[PDB]
């Protein structure tokens, strides 16, 4: 039995070993409880506002669009404490762990940002946090690894399998299944077994609510399209949710195309992968033909999740959302362009979403359109990779 639907059409579910179900049922229950509890909401609202900085601005970029008939706004999650949208849902998940009486937090991280984020929520809120990270990513994310540790978290490297995020995601589960009674598993994206895709969505949705209000305030009407990168789905579902019932509003998700779809070396399972069952759920997966899970590739470390949230696969299948891809070059061009014409260094991740907006504008410059891009994070962390590339080139 669950209280909510664990499925978005055919995708989603709860595929975990039997020993973990009481944990997901308990979590679902505590989340359902929390959403009707005014104290919980007021406490969440208060950290998002006075600790994390909400609401985030909505920024019109006239320099980018000049000479065209696009108007473009970026929702500045790069301004949120922590530097990316992930801090929203971690605070919510932490209050949940609290509300369940758990005292420890477990989280997985690839590029480091969800690990930094769970460690900051943990420190603030009195939880003991341990983070799993694949040794390959450890090697290549020392800033992050040191940030989490300055914040009292313990960082545990994962050496098995490809040693990256999916292997962190396995190690997180293994641990949860023997400590769930005291620990809560702060999953890092809107993915995984129910009720996580729904709870991550609901704790990121303020991004779309505030967008809507702001755009109505500044323009008098809803956008023609909202665009967001899609690594595992949290920022995009966050920007989309509140516009889902607004049929005239385009939802465009951007998955990394890496060196190029035809090359194989990409991160776009929703449009170029194949349905599978992994990580607690049924969704598009990057996988071989025999069914082993493979890694996602992208010039940006954070769109590494080799699968995608179920709700996006559903949205796609019914037509209600559109998903496209943007290559590393395209995303680097968009990065450059923002730095030089609006003076915002966007994350390479959010670079993908900006890049598809710029294509929308450029390919048809006399089309009349009002776009919002979700600038899911800041790109300070990417300054050197862009540096090394522009040097080799």
């Amino acid at each position: 039995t669950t209280l909510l639907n664990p499925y978005f059409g055919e995708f989603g579910g709860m595929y975990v070993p039997q020993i973990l179900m009481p944990a997901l049922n308990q979590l679902e229950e505590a989340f359902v409880s929390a959403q009707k509890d005014p104290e919980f909401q007021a406490q969440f609202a208060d950290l998002l506002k006075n600790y994390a900085g909400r609401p985030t601005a909505l920024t019109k970029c006239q320099n980018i669009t000049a000479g065209t008939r696009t108007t473009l706004y970026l929702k500045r999650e790069d301004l949120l404490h922590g530097g990316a949208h992930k801090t929203n849902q971690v605070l919510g998940q932490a209050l949940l762990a609290k509300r369940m009486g758990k005292s420890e937090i477990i989280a997985e991280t690839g590029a480091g940002q969800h690990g930094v984020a769970s460690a900051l929520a943990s420190a603030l809120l009195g939880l003991k946090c341990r983070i799993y990270m694949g040794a390959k990513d450890v090697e290549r994310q020392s800033p992050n690894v040191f940030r989490m540790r300055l914040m009292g978290a313990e960082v545990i490297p994962v050496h098995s399998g490809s040693a990256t995020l999916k292997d962190a995601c396995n190690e997180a589960l293994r641990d949860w299944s023997g400590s769930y009674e005291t620990a809560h598993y702060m999953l890092g994206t809107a993915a995984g077994p129910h009720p996580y895709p729904t709870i991550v969505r609901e704790f990121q949705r303020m991004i779309g609510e505030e967008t809507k209000a702001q755009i109505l305030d500044k323009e008098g009407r809803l956008p023609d399209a909202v665009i967001a990168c899609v690594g595992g789905g949290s920022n995009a579902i966050g920007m989309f949710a509140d516009f889902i019932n607004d049929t005239s509003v385009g939802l465009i998700g951007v998955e990394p195309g890496g060196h190029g779809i035809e090359t194989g070396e990409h991160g776009a399972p929703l449009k170029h992968g194949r349905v599978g069952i992994y990580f607690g759920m049924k969704a598009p997966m990057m996988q071989t033909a025999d069914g082993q899970i493979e890694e996602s590739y992208s010039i940006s470390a954070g769109l590494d999740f080799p699968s995608v949230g179920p709700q996006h696969a559903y949205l796609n299948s019914i037509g209600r959302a559109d998903y496209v891809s943007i290559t590393d070059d395209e995303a680097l061009e968009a990065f450059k362009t923002l730095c030089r014409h609006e003076g915002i260094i966007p994350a390479l991740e959010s670079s993908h979403a900006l890049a598809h907006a710029l294509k929308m504008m450029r390919e048809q410059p006399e089309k009349e359109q009002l776009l919002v891009v979700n600038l899911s994070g800041r790109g300070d962390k990417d300054i050197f990779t862009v540096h090394d590339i522009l040097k080799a080139r």
């Binding site: 975990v16 039997q18 396995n170 293994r174 069952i277 992994y278 025999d290 069914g291």
Partner: protein
């Protein structure tokens, strides 16, 4: 086929509990794997439990994670494991053979076709580690349609609702888990399982010494399964294949002997 029902009845006429070791197919290589398996049988296993190497075995501990990696170092694929199974069934008629699968490998090229391929190589059961009863329908159906017994794990904290689902939906044997965590007080489940006419329980997770096999049977379980310990042996002996089989032999005999009246 009814190999489990047959074994169970035979063992029950001997007043014996069942002893079933687990290995990963193709670890450390195919040939050596086939020899390990034959040695496990020749030493006394009542049934096998065999894993198909998978990239992301989120319910296993390190030991068996190394086993999959070694199997992958040697190129072993599912299509190879099935050929392995086939020659195992060819060599041994009556031994129940259960697979331990992860969901993706069964759902990959169509669920039904996975259970059909199981039937044509002679497999008797399949346990899918990351599909809970709540999500078992498609998998249990496809299983019964091809005569394979779908195995389920009964957790130590299982509540009565779950007990009944397991007893209703499983066949061949019931995997009685001794503990939470990953591979590395049961009297109640066991009585309740008999009460609901579950398939006979095999106690699993952490069985590594003969005393525990004996203790399981006394508790009322029809038997015990041991894998980590079996894999440990492999992983300890990689440098000498012959010593590998010899220690496998001795451990299995010791385990089997303990289930005896």
């Amino acid at each position: 086929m009814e190999r489990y029902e047959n074994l169970f009845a035979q063992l029950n006429d001997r007043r014996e509990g069942a002893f079933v070791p687990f290995v990963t197919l193709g670890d450390p290589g195919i040939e050596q794997s086939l020899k390990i398996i034959d040695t496990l049988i020749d030493a006394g296993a009542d049934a096998l439990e065999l894993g198909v190497p998978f990239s992301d075995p989120l319910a296993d501990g390190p030991t068996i994670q190394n086993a999959n990696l070694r199997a992958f170092a040697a190129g072993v694929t599912p299509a190879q494991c099935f050929e392995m199974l086939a020659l195992i069934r060819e060599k041994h008629p009556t031994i129940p053979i259960g697979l331990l699968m992860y969901a993706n490998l069964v759902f990959n090229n169509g669920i039904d076709a996975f259970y059909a391929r199981c039937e044509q190589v002679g497999v008797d059961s399949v346990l899918v580690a990351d599909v809970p009863v709540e999500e078992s329908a498609p998998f249990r159906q496809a299983a019964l349609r091809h005569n394979i017994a779908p195995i389920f794990i009964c957790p130590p904290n299982a509540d009565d609702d779950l007990l009944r689902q397991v007893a209703s939906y499983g066949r061949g044997y019931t995997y009685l888990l001794s503990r939470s965590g990953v591979t590395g007080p049961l009297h109640h489940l066991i009585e309740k399982l008999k009460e609901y006419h579950a398939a006979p329980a095999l106690q699993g997770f952490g069985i590594s010494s003969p005393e525990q096999v004996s203790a399981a049977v006394r508790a009322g379980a029809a038997g015990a399964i041991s894998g980590s310990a079996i894999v440990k042996i492999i992983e300890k002996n990689l440098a000498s294949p012959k010593q590998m089989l010899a220690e496998l032999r001795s451990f299995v005999s010791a385990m089997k002997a303990a289930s005896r009246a």
